[PDB]
């Protein structure tokens, strides 16, 4: 298989940012009304992918950058923990299986339709009857 | 009126299934004095008083938590209560979850055979715990143990060893003696921490 | 439930776009190529909703429109098809439950992080170990 | 000199699992003359002769495809052949596929009951169908039927009514005679062209 493919590759940076969270747990946990943000299935379901995403984007472009104002004494510990979600981050965007499943089909199909001599025009017209039948297929899944 | 004063720290210690809720006393604390325990869960703000008048300096809130492990962690909070009079709360200071329970070993089993010290780790098993709710479901992945082992008839000093399963070998290459081991749990990609089990010995010739 | 969600109202339009299909059918399965570009499974699944769009729009955009620089005789039909595959397209967008359902879960958050009067900082710092959690639960389930 | 005329024409008539192939005769055909037949499978490039020398004008190929209402479709050629002569193949013009089966209907059951005409179309099971292959899960959505209603004592004109389901009511209001009708299968859709079933009559009151 791949390596950024294998959890086990996550295992180390997932407990420095836990060790890096727990020194100053007690800081960022003060305030804490007692809601809860993200819940747990918030990354669950079939599109869990796509939140992931989202959140890990979401942290590294804003929450933690916004973080070194609200929290001008833990800069330092920001920092570390910004840095190794990155890490985390360039390595699960190496490895399909960890993203979203649509943009491998999506991938596949369309480096089919462009192998061919004709950049798949042919095929695609030929195939009207068998897309019909997909389409019709797809209403009726959900 | 009512204004005593307030327990300076409220604190959970807690290992698998034992959420144990711990705070300092009041100074000029009172024979009368008692302490009230209330518990409040992440995602529904408000509290809930588990205990009106406990006179003690501890509490076991595993009865109420056992969803822990499923959860998004509660908070805790005690005051200080004198019949009519009473402290401000004292709450926990940070979220407790799975990440603050320290994790901790049943037991270890020893056995000789072949020239092989064959050890099985006895993960916890406390009877609150829900059926399905087992440490190896709980803690799915990379669960790690150091092994301390050192020879009786050697002294106060010991070898590591790290493995990454309940099961382990350490050969007794035509040694004989005493062997004795201790296990430290972990989880690799975890922070919680976790204590040394009590030592167990075995030994290899006759003895 | 919506019209344009019930799979009752593209019935017709999807037995339109067969016969005129049907009539044309010998000369655009004519070719000497019988692989299958559009497999059995490929809308089918959690993906299925975004490759479903993406064959849409690949027809409707790139395929149709060369088609009739293909099979000039054939304008009429293709022109027809293109134009019932088309009204079937918009139709389903005013569907949410035809598409994917990957944009509710990030409204909200998005907008639960709006609501505060930092933007959601706080809360998003003070749920790190949350995040780590779920990113951990995230890897092991893919 | 392996030059023989091809076969004209190559198509397919089928109806639910009842997959036959039809092919013109080449002219000047002789008595030592017979025709191969070959099929292709979407999704694999090779062709497998189904039949090496055939002296009809015809041939099911239903044994070899079961797959065709879970399959991309198949295509089909037969040439001629006399002893070491034939030939080039003459290929179907489209892919074969459930789209191009001709729906039919088993049978029609007709009762009446307080003044109701309740009837039951029975869809076709034929034998070489795989169990779980019915024309119901096959055709799994719109099945539609028409039927046309003619009275006995009436005559050869008759009036149509559409109905979504299997199972049909006419109101007999107050009338006396002979019903008869027949039923035409589709789906809503598809293309899929249907044909009129062998009429049914019964009869009101004694
Ligand atoms: C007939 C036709 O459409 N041919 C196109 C060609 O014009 C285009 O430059 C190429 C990509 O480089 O794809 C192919
Ligand atoms: C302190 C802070 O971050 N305030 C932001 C403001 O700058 C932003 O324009 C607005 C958008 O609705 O959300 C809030």
């Known amino acids: 298989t791949k390596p950024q493919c294998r959890p086990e590759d996550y295992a180390t940076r997932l407990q420095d940012l836990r060790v890096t969270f727990h020194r100053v747990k007690?800081?960022?946990?003060?305030?804490?009304?007692?809601?809860?943000?993200?819940?747990?299935?918030?990354?669950?379901?079939?599109?869990?992918?796509?939140?992931?995403?989202?959140?890990?984007?979401?942290?590294?472009?804003?929450?933690?950058?916004?973080?070194?104002?609200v929290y001008p004494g833990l800069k330092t510990e920001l920092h570390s923990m910004r840095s190794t979600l990155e890490?985390?981050?360039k390595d699960m965007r190496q490895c399909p299986l960890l993203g979203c499943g649509d943009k491998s089909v999506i991938s596949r199909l369309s480096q089919e339709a462009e192998?061919?001599?004709?950049?798949?025009?042919?095929?695609?017209?030929?195939?009207?009857?068998?897309?019909?039948?997909?389409?019709?297929e797809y209403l009726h899944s959900r | 009126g009512t204004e005593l004063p307030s327990p300076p720290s409220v604190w959970f210690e807690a290992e698998?299934?034992?959420?144990?809720?711990?705070?300092?006393?009041?100074?000029?604390?009172?024979?009368?004095?008692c302490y009230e325990v209330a518990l409040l869960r992440y995602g529904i703000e408000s509290w809930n008083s588990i205990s009106q008048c406990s006179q003690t300096l501890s509490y076991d809130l595993t009865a109420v938590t056992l969803?822990?492990?499923?959860?998004?962690?509660?908070?805790?909070?005690?005051?200080?209560?004198?019949?009519?009079?009473?402290?401000?709360?004292?709450?926990?200071?940070?979220?407790?979850?799975?990440?603050?329970?320290?994790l901790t070993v049943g037991s270890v089993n020893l056995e000789i055979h072949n020239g092989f010290?064959?050890?099985?780790?006895?993960?916890?098993?406390?009877?609150?715990?829900?059926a399905q709710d087992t440490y190896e479901s709980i803690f799915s992945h990379f669960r790690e143990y150091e092994i301390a082992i050192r020879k009786v008839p050697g002294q106060?000093?010991?070898?590591?060893?790290?493995?990454?399963?309940?099961?382990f070998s350490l050969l007794t290459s035509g040694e004989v003696g005493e062997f004795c081991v201790q296990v430290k749990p972990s989880v690799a990609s975890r922070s919680n921490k976790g204590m040394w089990s009590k030592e167990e010995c075995i030994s290899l010739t006759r003895q």
């Open chain 1, 26 to 69: 007690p800081t960022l946990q003060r305030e804490d009304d007692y809601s809860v943000w993200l819940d747990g299935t918030v990354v669950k379901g079939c599109w869990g992918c796509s939140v992931m995403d989202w959140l890990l984007r979401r942290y590294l472009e804003i929450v933690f950058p916004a973080g070194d104002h």
């Open chain 1, 115 to 136: 192998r061919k001599s004709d950049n798949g025009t042919r095929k695609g017209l030929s195939e009207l009857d068998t897309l019909f039948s997909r389409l019709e």
């Open chain 2, 67 to 102: 969803d822990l492990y499923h959860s998004n962690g509660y908070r805790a909070r005690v005051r200080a209560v004198d019949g009519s009079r009473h402290s401000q709360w004292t709450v926990t200071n940070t979220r407790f979850s799975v990440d603050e329970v320290t």
């Open chain 2, 117 to 130: 010290i064959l050890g099985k780790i006895q993960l916890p098993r406390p009877k609150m715990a829900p």
């Open chain 1, 87 to 89: 890490s985390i981050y």
């Open chain 2, 16 to 33: 698998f299934f034992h959420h144990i809720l711990h705070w300092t006393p009041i100074p000029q604390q009172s024979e009368s004095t």
């Open chain 2, 156 to 167: 106060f000093t010991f070898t590591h060893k790290k493995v990454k399963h309940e099961q």
